[PDB]
Design a protein around this ligand. Structure first.
Ligand code: CL
Ligand code: CL
Length: 91
C-alpha cells in the first residue's frame, strides 16, 4: 500500500521478541531476529525493516539508546511505524 506498515505490539511474557540494532557511525535503527510466535512476528515485523516512529514520534535521527528507551517506556504496548529500506529513503 501507499502507507507505511504500522505494527502494533502487545508485550508478552518474554517481551516483544525482536532485536533492534544500529550500524557504526550511522543513524538508523533496524529490526533483526524476529522470534517465531512472538508479538513481533504476529504484528508483521521483518528482519531488515527500518524503524521510523515509535508511538507517534519520529526516531529517525535518534540514538540507539534513545530509541530503546522510547520502546521500553511504553510498558505494555508499542506502535512501530517501519519501512523497507530497499524501497524507502528519507530525503
Ligand atoms: Cl536477522
Ligand atoms: Cl516500505
Amino acid at each position: 500500500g501507499m502507507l507505511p506498515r504500522l505494527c502494533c505490539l502487545e508485550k508478552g511474557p518474554n517481551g516483544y521478541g525482536f532485536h533492534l540494532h544500529g550500524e557504526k557511525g550511522k543513524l538508523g535503527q533496524y529490526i533483526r531476529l524476529v522470534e517465531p510466535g512472538s508479538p513481533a512476528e504476529k504484528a508483521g515485523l521483518l528482519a531488515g525493516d527500518r524503524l521510523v516512529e515509535v508511538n507517534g514520534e519520529n526516531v529517525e535521527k535518534e540514538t540507539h539508546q534513545q530509541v530503546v528507551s522510547r520502546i521500553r517506556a511504553a510498558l505494555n504496548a508499542v506502535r512501530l511505524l517501519v519501512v523497507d529500506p530497499e524501497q524507502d529513503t528519507r530525503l
